[PDB]
């Protein structure tokens, strides 16, 4: 089954950007049957597809395959891919808390 995890990522400055050190796939505008990480291939949610060795997300405990449920209290289960990306990369936010589930 899935276990709930709560991680707290402190973004890393890389030049002008604040970065999280991971990648995402999914979103309501994408084909969920293409998601290799989900248990249920109708799941249109946002999944962690890669984590950078030594980066903020790794340090915080994020793992490849995690499903992102919320970012700073903001629901991520019914958003487009771009909407998810934007929520994760707000320039004004250095700290982001992710609610995730992990198989």
């Amino acid at each position: 089954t899935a276990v709930v995890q709560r991680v707290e990522i402190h973004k890393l400055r890389q030049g002008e950007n604040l970065i999280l050190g991971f990648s995402i796939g999914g979103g309501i505008d994408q084909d969920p049957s293409q998601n290799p990480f989900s248990e249920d291939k109708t799941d249109k949610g946002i999944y962690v597809t890669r984590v950078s060795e030594g980066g903020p997300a790794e340090i915080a405990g994020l793992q490849i395959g995690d499903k992102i449920m919320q970012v700073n209290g903001w629901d991520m289960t019914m958003v487009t891919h771009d909407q998810a990306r934007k929520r994760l990369t707000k320039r004004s936010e250095e700290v982001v808390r992710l609610l995730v589930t992990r198989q």
Partner: peptide, 10 residues
Amino acid sequence: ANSRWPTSII
């Protein structure tokens, strides 16, 4: 990578 399933670096 999968052209039918984009990923984004953040």
